[PDB]
Structure formats: C-alpha cells, structure tokens
C-alpha cells in the first residue's frame, strides 16, 4: 500500500550509487552507535560508497523501512538491494565475506 512515487524515491535513492548507506549522521560525523561503527568498518573495506542521514528526512526513515521491511537503522544497500544493518554486516567481515558482497556476487 506505499504510495507510488514514495516507491519511485526510494528505488532512486537505494540506486544513488553502487554501495549506499542509510545511517544517522554522515561520513563527518555519525551519530554514537550503531551508525558510526558501521561507517568504520566500510571505511577499513576501502570501497567507495555514499550516505544518506535518515536524522534529515522522515518520509525517507519511515519509507524505507516499509519499503525494504527492515525496521532499523542502519541499513546498506549494494546494487540496489539491502544487505542489511552493522550486525550482518560484521558477521559478514568475520566470515570474509564482505567484500565479495560490497563487489555484487
Ligand atoms: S553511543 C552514546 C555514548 N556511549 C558510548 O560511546 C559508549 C562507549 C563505551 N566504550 C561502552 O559503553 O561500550 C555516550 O554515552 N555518550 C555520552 C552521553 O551522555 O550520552
Ligand atoms: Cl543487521
Ligand atoms: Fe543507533
């Protein structure tokens, strides 16, 4: 029942670019927590990526959990898919498979 061009937004802002991150804060200065650790370890992958501050934009933060069914923060998309939050995403490190995930495979 998403609004049709909510759902337009949202495929847009998910396909900004390959690797993107839906976090509190931004590259600068993520908010304490869960947001700022997962900026770190994307930062020690050396992939390129990009933000969006869900703190700034209510429609986004509240959309896009409807639209990905995933009901936190915060949330990284590759190719325009969820990968998931900081918890998958060291789970993923620990098992080396990271980087296979960041690169589309
Ligand atoms: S994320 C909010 C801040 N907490 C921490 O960074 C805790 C880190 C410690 N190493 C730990 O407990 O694991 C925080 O409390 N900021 C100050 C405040 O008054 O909110
Ligand atoms: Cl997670
Ligand atoms: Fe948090």
Not at 1 to 17: D, G, H, Q
Not at 54 to 61: A, N, Q, S, T
Not at 72 to 97: R, S
Request: hydrophobic content about 35%; aromatic content about 8%.
């Amino acid at each position: 029942s998403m609004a049709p061009k909510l759902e337009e937004r949202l495929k847009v802002l998910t396909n900004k670019a390959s690797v993107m991150l839906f976090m509190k804060g931004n590259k600068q200065e993520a908010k304490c927590g869960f947001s700022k650790q997962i900026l770190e370890i994307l930062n020690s992958t050396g992939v390129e990526y990009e933000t969006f501050d869900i703190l700034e934009d209510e429609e986004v933060r509240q959309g896009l959990k409807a639209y990905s069914n995933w009901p936190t923060y915060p949330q990284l998309y590759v190719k325009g898919e969820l990968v998931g939050g900081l918890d998958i995403v060291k789970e993923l490190k620990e098992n080396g498979e990271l980087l296979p995930i960041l690169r589309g495979e």
